Design an enzyme around this catalytic site. Structure first.
Site, PDB file in Angstrom:
ATOM      1  N   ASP A 108       0.833  -1.209   0.000  1.00 18.86           N
ATOM      2  CA  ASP A 108       0.000   0.000   0.000  1.00 18.86           C
ATOM      3  C   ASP A 108       0.861   1.249   0.000  1.00 18.86           C
ATOM      4  O   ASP A 108       0.644   2.163  -0.768  1.00 18.86           O
ATOM      5  CB  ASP A 108      -0.932   0.032   1.205  1.00 18.86           C
ATOM      6  CG  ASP A 108      -1.903   1.221   1.177  1.00 18.86           C
ATOM      7  OD1 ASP A 108      -1.510   2.353   1.477  1.00 18.86           O
ATOM      8  OD2 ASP A 108      -3.092   1.003   0.880  1.00 18.86           O
ATOM      9  N   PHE A 186       4.004   2.942  -9.480  1.00 18.78           N
ATOM     10  CA  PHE A 186       4.643   1.647  -9.802  1.00 18.78           C
ATOM     11  C   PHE A 186       5.082   0.917  -8.531  1.00 18.78           C
ATOM     12  O   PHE A 186       5.505   1.528  -7.567  1.00 18.78           O
ATOM     13  CB  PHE A 186       5.829   1.814 -10.754  1.00 18.78           C
ATOM     14  CG  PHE A 186       5.502   2.601 -11.990  1.00 18.78           C
ATOM     15  CD1 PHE A 186       4.824   2.018 -13.044  1.00 18.78           C
ATOM     16  CD2 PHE A 186       5.879   3.934 -12.091  1.00 18.78           C
ATOM     17  CE1 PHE A 186       4.499   2.761 -14.174  1.00 18.78           C
ATOM     18  CE2 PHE A 186       5.572   4.681 -13.210  1.00 18.78           C
ATOM     19  CZ  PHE A 186       4.879   4.092 -14.253  1.00 18.78           C
TER      20      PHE A 186
HETATM   21  C1  HEM Z   1      -1.521  -0.986  12.562  1.00 12.89           C
HETATM   22  C2  HEM Z   1      -1.719  -0.935  11.258  1.00 12.89           C
HETATM   23  C3  HEM Z   1      -2.150   0.304  10.560  1.00 12.89           C
HETATM   24  C4  HEM Z   1      -2.236   1.681  11.037  1.00 12.89           C
HETATM   25  C5  HEM Z   1      -1.881   2.288  12.355  1.00 12.89           C
HETATM   26  C6  HEM Z   1      -2.795   2.364   9.840  1.00 12.89           C
HETATM   27  C7  HEM Z   1      -2.993   3.794   9.849  1.00 12.89           C
HETATM   28  C8  HEM Z   1      -3.363   4.555   8.663  1.00 12.89           C
HETATM   29  C9  HEM Z   1      -3.597   6.037   8.750  1.00 12.89           C
HETATM   30  C10 HEM Z   1      -3.552   6.961   9.942  1.00 12.89           C
HETATM   31  C11 HEM Z   1      -3.933   6.437   7.379  1.00 12.89           C
HETATM   32  C12 HEM Z   1      -4.322   7.814   6.884  1.00 12.89           C
HETATM   33  C13 HEM Z   1      -5.833   7.923   6.970  1.00 12.89           C
HETATM   34  C14 HEM Z   1      -6.375   9.218   6.375  1.00 12.89           C
HETATM   35  O1  HEM Z   1      -6.191  10.318   6.979  1.00 12.89           O
HETATM   36  O2  HEM Z   1      -7.022   9.149   5.296  1.00 12.89           O
HETATM   37  C15 HEM Z   1      -3.844   5.181   6.619  1.00 12.89           C
HETATM   38  C16 HEM Z   1      -4.149   5.225   5.229  1.00 12.89           C
HETATM   39  C17 HEM Z   1      -4.178   4.035   4.406  1.00 12.89           C
HETATM   40  N1  HEM Z   1      -4.005   2.802   4.881  1.00 12.89           N
HETATM   41 FE1  HEM Z   1      -3.848   2.095   6.852  1.00 12.89          FE
HETATM   42  N2  HEM Z   1      -3.021   1.614   8.739  1.00 12.89           N
HETATM   43  C18 HEM Z   1      -2.669   0.375   9.183  1.00 12.89           C
HETATM   44  C19 HEM Z   1      -2.697  -0.825   8.361  1.00 12.89           C
HETATM   45  C20 HEM Z   1      -3.019  -0.816   6.934  1.00 12.89           C
HETATM   46  C21 HEM Z   1      -3.142  -2.096   6.175  1.00 12.89           C
HETATM   47  C22 HEM Z   1      -2.960  -3.473   6.735  1.00 12.89           C
HETATM   48  C23 HEM Z   1      -3.458  -1.639   4.814  1.00 12.89           C
HETATM   49  C24 HEM Z   1      -3.712  -2.449   3.596  1.00 12.89           C
HETATM   50  C25 HEM Z   1      -3.603  -3.770   3.539  1.00 12.89           C
HETATM   51  C26 HEM Z   1      -3.539  -0.159   4.884  1.00 12.89           C
HETATM   52  C27 HEM Z   1      -3.870   0.644   3.736  1.00 12.89           C
HETATM   53  C28 HEM Z   1      -4.028   2.082   3.764  1.00 12.89           C
HETATM   54  C29 HEM Z   1      -4.201   2.816   2.497  1.00 12.89           C
HETATM   55  C30 HEM Z   1      -4.269   2.288   1.102  1.00 12.89           C
HETATM   56  C31 HEM Z   1      -4.289   4.184   2.941  1.00 12.89           C
HETATM   57  C32 HEM Z   1      -4.443   5.421   2.126  1.00 12.89           C
HETATM   58  C33 HEM Z   1      -3.044   5.816   1.712  1.00 12.89           C
HETATM   59  C34 HEM Z   1      -3.149   7.087   0.920  1.00 12.89           C
HETATM   60  O3  HEM Z   1      -3.235   8.145   1.594  1.00 12.89           O
HETATM   61  O4  HEM Z   1      -3.148   6.999  -0.337  1.00 12.89           O
HETATM   62  N3  HEM Z   1      -3.138   0.405   6.150  1.00 12.89           N
HETATM   63  N4  HEM Z   1      -3.385   3.982   7.313  1.00 12.89           N
HETATM   64 CA   LIG Z   2       5.770   3.094  -5.826  1.00 15.72          CA
END
Ligand code: HEM
Ligand SMILES: [Ca+2]
Ligand SMILES: *[C@@H]1O[C@H](CO)[C@@H](O[C@@H]2O[C@H](CO)[C@@H](O)[C@H](O)[C@H]2NC(C)=O)[C@H](O)[C@H]1NC(C)=O
Ligand SMILES: *[C@@H]1O[C@H](CO)[C@@H](O)[C@H](O)[C@H]1NC(C)=O
Ligand SMILES: *[C@@H]1O[C@H](CO)[C@@H](O)[C@H](O)[C@H]1NC(C)=O
Ligand SMILES: *[C@@H]1O[C@H](CO)[C@@H](O)[C@H](O)[C@H]1NC(C)=O
Ligand SMILES: [NH3+]CCc1ccccc1
Length: 595
Positions: A108, A186
């Site tokens: 991601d 990519f």
């Molecule tokens: C303990 C584990 C994790 C924490 C603390 C976490 C925390 C976050 C936080 C704070 C955001 C930004 C949210 C926003 O303001 O929109 C985020 C975005 C995202 N997370 Fe999670 N996350 C976790 C695990 C994951 C997993 C397991 C996946 C996918 C399998 C994931 C995929 C995403 C994606 C695709 C975004 C948007 C990224 C972007 O801004 O383009 N994250 N994550």
């Molecule tokens: Ca990349």
């Protein structure tokens, strides 16, 4: 549609055209259309954006403005009534290691990042969002509904600042608002190397001709490398322990230290790089740092692609893998390789695979020390727990021997993430990832669930009874329809995730379609795809073909007992073998011939 193309990007890029290596920014991947897939461009719009004013104003903003004749429900209310649950017992996935979750997060982070707008580092309006909870400009606070306990404890809202958008940072009023993707589309290890030239360089070791990525000089992990500290203050890894004074890590992707296991896999990757660099020097002593860096970078690039595409994606997409990502047929310069805005939400299915605890396992895969297990919420921006409490190895064994959370229609997201999220700049372990995802769908102008159903050539339920049949869950369907009055209003993030998993997979049909398409496009649309004729030698490929996350562990830790199939649930000692039983990366085909 509007202006040929928007006026204020990163305008200076000259394509070498002969270069055998990916640029840092991802520019020049596509030759005909060089900005394609490059970082700090607009996220792709697979469907037109939907905003309450048709342009920028997110649904849910203006009290009196409906979506399809209905008020959109409070993000946080959707979180509370649907996403949340009490009991963590029986929630684990019996066939996916904790690594399956973590790898998702890694992948991601390589693909997309739509960071919050800066709009001014000098900001009393930043204070106006957190304190006074007043909606304005880029402050789009998540208001607590009536009956919310955080109301009794945290004020009226959770602050939330709108994502950046292309053209200007100040207002834009012509084409509909497109949010930025600050990383390269990519699958190219940009999470390790950077998506900008500064950082790409700051990250590198420019102190010797060795092609090394810079490493931490303060601390070591039983002789193994840590990433450098990010010395910019305020450091939220510092903030979560005043005493420890351990800063966040400094990696290609700014979120690396977000949680301890993400930092962990970052550390593994850095190590791998340097490890590769060193073998290339043994095998090729004549090579300048630059060529060591790049060739290592490229091996690493391909490793991430294989693990992702061979091991990871098939167990997400399952019976749909084949229908969306069939066998590679070479690069195609007409495939759009950009991450779509919707993907960045689709791939958040991973939020529901995160369990409530993380463990440290000793060399017998048993609780390392007295506090082996820890709550997830104490590990946000927590680097000290790695440096001052066992290093990488015990966390890594945890990743292998522990389980991912199974997504569950009655147990969506752990309160670790849903009530106790820590965000930097802010102070409390008291935020809601689920609610944040929802406000963000809106912030990004996402079409509703049924729009995306239409897109994927799937039925579009219009009724309760209809939604129940798609979700295979009466109660869930009622809850959602009591909040959203029409399935047309259901936010994509919650809707897609609401769907039962496909056979052999871990996402429902809608998601599998969205994910499957994106991943198909990032592979097919990538000139530098590892398996594209000419990128690697055909001897080199027979070598790359045997990579494994297990091997990566073996090489870059002191974990000697590993499973063969790292992503499935694995119990020690039965499913574990010695590192000796695991195929190695033979860097023979990287021996250089000047003569
Ligand atoms: C303990 C584990 C994790 C924490 C603390 C976490 C925390 C976050 C936080 C704070 C955001 C930004 C949210 C926003 O303001 O929109 C985020 C975005 C995202 N997370 Fe999670 N996350 C976790 C695990 C994951 C997993 C397991 C996946 C996918 C399998 C994931 C995929 C995403 C994606 C695709 C975004 C948007 C990224 C972007 O801004 O383009 N994250 N994550
Ligand atoms: Ca990349
Ligand atoms: C902040 O981190 C410090 C740094 O270790 C922690 O203090 C240690 O606690 C462990 C037992 O859990 C002892 O083995 C160490 O000897 C202690 N070191 C010091 C300097 O006291 C502390 O627990 C952390 N605190 C918080 C609030 O998270
Ligand atoms: C760069 O590599 C040299 C030679 O191995 C090493 O001495 C130096 O510490 C490295 N510098 C950093 C910041 O890692
Ligand atoms: C490449 O992709 C495009 C659009 O998806 C399609 O038009 C084209 O036929 C594909 N190329 C080849 C060589 O089959
Ligand atoms: C576990 O999943 C793997 C794929 O990751 C599959 O090959 C295997 O059959 C599964 N084992 C069980 C018991 O389901
Ligand atoms: N994966 C999300 C990483 C993250 C977490 C908290 C603030 C900023 C970024």
């Amino acid at each position: 549609s509007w202006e040929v193309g928007c006026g204020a990007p990163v305008p200076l890029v000259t394509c070498d055209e002969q270069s055998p290596y990916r640029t840092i920014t991802g520019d020049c991947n596509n030759r005909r259309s060089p900005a394609l897939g490059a970082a700090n461009r607009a996220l792709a719009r697979w469907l037109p954006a939907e905003y309450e004013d048709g342009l920028a104003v997110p649904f849910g903003w203006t009290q009196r403005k409906t979506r399809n004749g209905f008020r959109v429900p409070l993000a946080r209310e959707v979180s509370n009534k649907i996403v949340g649950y009490l009991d963590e017992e029986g929630v684990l996935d019996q066939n996916r290691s904790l690594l399956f979750m973590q790898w998702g997060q890694i992948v991601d982070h390589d693909l997309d990042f739509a960071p919050e707008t800066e709009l001014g580092s000098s900001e009393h309006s930043k204070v106006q969002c957190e304190e006074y909870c007043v909606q304005g400009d880029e402050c789009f606070p998540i208001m607590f509904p009536k009956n919310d306990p955080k109301l009794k404890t945290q004020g009226k809202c959770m602050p939330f600042f709108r994502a950046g958008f292309v053209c200007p940072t100040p207002p834009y009023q012509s084409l509909a608002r497109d949010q930025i993707n600050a990383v390269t589309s990519f699958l190219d290890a940009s999470l390790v190397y950077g998506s900008e030239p500064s950082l790409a360089s700051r990250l590198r070791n420019l102190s010797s001709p060795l092609g090394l990525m810079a490493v931490n000089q303060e601390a070591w992990d039983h002789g193994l490398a840590y990433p450098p500290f990010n010395n910019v203050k305020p450091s939220p890894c510092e903030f979560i322990n005043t005493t420890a004074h351990v800063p966040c890590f400094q990696a290609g992707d700014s979120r690396a230290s977000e949680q301890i296991l993400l930092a962990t896999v970052h550390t593994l990757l850095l190590r791998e790089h340097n490890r590769l660099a060193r073998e290339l020097k043994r095998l090729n002593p004549h090579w300048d740092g630059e060529m060591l860096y790049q060739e290592a970078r490229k091996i690493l690039g391909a490793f991430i692609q294989i693990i992702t595409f061979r091991d990871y994606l098939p167990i997400v997409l399952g019976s749909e893998m084949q229908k969306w990502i069939p066998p590679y047929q070479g690069y195609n310069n007409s495939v759009d390789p950009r991450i779509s805005n919707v993907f960045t939400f689709a791939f958040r299915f991973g939020h529901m695979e995160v369990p409530s605890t993380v463990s440290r396992l000793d060399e017998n895969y048993q609780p390392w020390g007295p506090e082996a297990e820890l709550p997830l919420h104490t590990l946000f921006f927590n680097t000290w727990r790695i440096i001052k409490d066992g290093g990488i190895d015990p966390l890594v064994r945890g990743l292998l021997a522990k389980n991912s959370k199974l997504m569950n229609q009655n147990k969506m997201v752990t309160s670790e993430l849903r009530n106790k999220l820590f965000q930097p700049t802010h102070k409390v372990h008291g935020f809601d990832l689920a609610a944040i995802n929802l406000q963000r769908c809106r912030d990004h102008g996402m079409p509703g669930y049924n729009s995306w159903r239409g897109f994927c050539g799937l039925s579009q339920p219009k009724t309760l009874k209809g939604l129940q049949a798609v979700l295979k869950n009466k109660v869930l369907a009622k809850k959602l329809l009591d909040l959203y009055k029409t399935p047309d209003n259901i936010d994509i993030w919650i809707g897609g995730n609401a769907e039962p998993m496909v056979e052999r997979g871990r996402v429902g049909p809608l998601l599998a379609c969205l994910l499957g398409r994106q991943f198909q496009q990032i592979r097919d649309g990538d000139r530098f795809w590892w398996e594209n004729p000419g990128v690697f030698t055909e001897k080199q490929r027979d070598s790359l073909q045997k990579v494994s996350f297990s091997r990566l562990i073996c090489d870059n830790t002191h974990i000697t007992k590993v499973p063969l199939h790292a992503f499935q649930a694995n119990n020690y000692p039965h499913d574990f073998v010695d590192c000796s039983a695991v195929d190695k990366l033979d860097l023979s085909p990287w021996a250089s011939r000047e003569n």
